[PDB]
Ligand binder design. Sequence first.
Ligand SMILES: N=C(N)c1cccc(-c2nocc2C(=O)Nc2ccc(-c3ccccc3S(N)(=O)=O)cc2)c1
Ligand SMILES: [Ca+2]
Length: 223
Amino acid sequence: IVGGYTCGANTVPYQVSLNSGYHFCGGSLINSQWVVSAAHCYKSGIQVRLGEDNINVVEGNEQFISASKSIVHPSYNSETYNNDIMLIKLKSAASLNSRVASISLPTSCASAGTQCLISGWGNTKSSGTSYPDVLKCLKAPILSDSSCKSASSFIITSNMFCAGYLEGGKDACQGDSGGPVVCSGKLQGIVSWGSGCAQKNKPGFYTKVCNYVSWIKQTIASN
Ligand SMILES: N=C(N)c1cccc(-c2nocc2C(=O)Nc2ccc(-c3ccccc3S(N)(=O)=O)cc2)c1
Ligand SMILES: [Ca+2]
């Protein structure tokens, strides 16, 4: 997160860190046994870290749980970044509490102008590199489909939305990938991609979760 604020410990209790010896992506807890993340985050040997604020220090509310299965969406295409969503099942059920909680799936898609909460432990600078230890937060509005398209030298599919600030300065970044975009108490977005971070006319793009609820629900039922 570039140009955001310190969330405060456990204020985003569905925020999850994916660890393979180091933090590499965010995720969202959607029930006691399932995490939703980004397809482009896939890798073997993932450990899901719940209840984190400072990811470098044992603070007392962590739950670390191994992934038992990962399911990348059938149609995830890394040349297009289309369908950038993956489900991770945990080897044991998380103990749910005030600091470790699930986030509701959307029943309907969010609209342009809607203010959303985006969070992660990703890079905090548009130029250079600084990675925070505690969780950062950014409130950003969803931007129109037309301005999203105009502000991108890549192809934008209907399973993407963009959000943030065309002026620049405020955006998610590398390391935030996979993490939540929460709008009116529903998981609407997954940090998917951006051309650099927080640059002029280079807004953040996110996986349109509302499009996937049926697949999410059916896959969980069956695994
Ligand atoms: N600024 C952001 N919102 C953001 C969020 C997460 C990661 C990064 C990021 N931090 O550094 C680089 C990054 C990046 O995402 N680069 C990037 C650019 C384009 C694509 C892409 C988009 C559509 C089709 C194809 C591609 S791709 N993968 O072929 O290039 C993928 C990744 C930035
Ligand atoms: Ca910690």
